[PDB]
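ligand=chloride ion
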Amino acid sequence: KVGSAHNVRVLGSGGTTVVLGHGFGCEQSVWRHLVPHLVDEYRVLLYDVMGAGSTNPDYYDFVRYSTLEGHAHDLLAILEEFTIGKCIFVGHSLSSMVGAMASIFRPDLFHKLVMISASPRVLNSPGYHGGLDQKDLDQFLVAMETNYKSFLSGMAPLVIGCDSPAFQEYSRTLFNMRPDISLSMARTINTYDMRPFLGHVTVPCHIIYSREDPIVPVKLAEYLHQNLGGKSIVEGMSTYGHLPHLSAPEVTIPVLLRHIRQDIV
Amino acid sequence: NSKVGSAHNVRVLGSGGTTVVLGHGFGCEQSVWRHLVPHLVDEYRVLLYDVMGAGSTNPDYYDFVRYSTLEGHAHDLLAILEEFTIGKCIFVGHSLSSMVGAMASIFRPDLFHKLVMISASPRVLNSPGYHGGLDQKDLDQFLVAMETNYKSFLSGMAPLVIGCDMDSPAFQEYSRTLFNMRPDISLSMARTINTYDMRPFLGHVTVPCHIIYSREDPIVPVKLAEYLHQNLGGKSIVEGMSTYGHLPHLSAPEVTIPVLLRHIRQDIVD
Ligand SMILES: [Cl-]
Ligand SMILES: [Cl-]
């Protein structure tokens, strides 16, 4: 039931499983440049976040997935059913914080977290620059609801940092979502706040960021580094855009492989 | 039953569309609610469950890092609510479970109509501007004794915490579940309950909270009820009871149950 609802796919073999969680507007196919480098050494688990176009719209509970917790409980259900022991969790954007929260609920299931383009909170706050003002978020959400296809055609190039073979792939999965579900997920990712809980994350975290992410300010990597409760390490990449694992896999995948295989300290 | 249901001995009783969820405190099991349940079943669905680590649960399911935080237990509560409820529950939590429920309501406020807290404390330790009631040196020596002479520590602790006669049914019930716990797990839970700090999280709680306290609670200063009242992020109300002990829902049900029923049935204005 859980494996079908999330298109769970297991590849490779080994005593350690690597779990890959995609971000908004993507599907598990976004990891295609990474999986072949891992299967010979690791078991690799792929899954789709509920609400992706590849998933059944009947399973999208709008109240449950108005919160980050609903996606975290989905991840935990996937790990309990399909893994054993501790896994290496890799998560881009939304799924990086999904995994952060899931590791507080079940630290006994994670060896480490590898975060790509991670942000504990997008909205600006008195002493915190997430990169987005509340009144701008409201305008983006209204614009997304009224002129859906026009909004996505302008946003996704900016998010990839492009426009244009680099963003065609992201466009395919982004428009695969149903507009009402896409709008609900966009609100959840732009309104969660993981700041109060970072100090209770105890598993090692590898913080990977794009040095020119339009959604994620560079200083947030340092913010995460300073406020996570356990050990962490930070590495920046000379990439442009919010999805470096898709637009620039020749630079991003070697970085991911290094932080997956090597442990802090 | 379900995986989460069997792990926590989930039991569902009562009748009607609104569900009252009862979460017990340290050293108790769901049988601590013996006097409240029969006053609810003709009007409310009642969900009972055991906190992981209680003697009635499987020791193999208790991971010491997992349950070293309130989030670990709140995850279990959220799993239980998502599985056995579809509406907004009325959560009644004693001591440990009052903060578990508060923490759970931060992740999913949509699942809670209100929180009814019994003997609640956001932090036991004293700090420069905050009187939790216990100094660090006392906690350290309690935890050492709890590890060095565990049964001797428990035998001296139980009658003082429940504060009632040892020839009473309240002490028998409490002593049974307290000694039912596995010692290493008991020490783990005691370390968690005496080291969590909910003060930074109170402002993020937004569901209505009813703060019920025992005026002579040997564990919880009366003043903390007002501290919770001042610092919770949503509506809250305070009511004290002329009872003696930390577990008045078990030791003084004639006083406590009428108070709980009123706060379960009435919203915060009433
Ligand atoms: Cl995202
Ligand atoms: Cl307790």
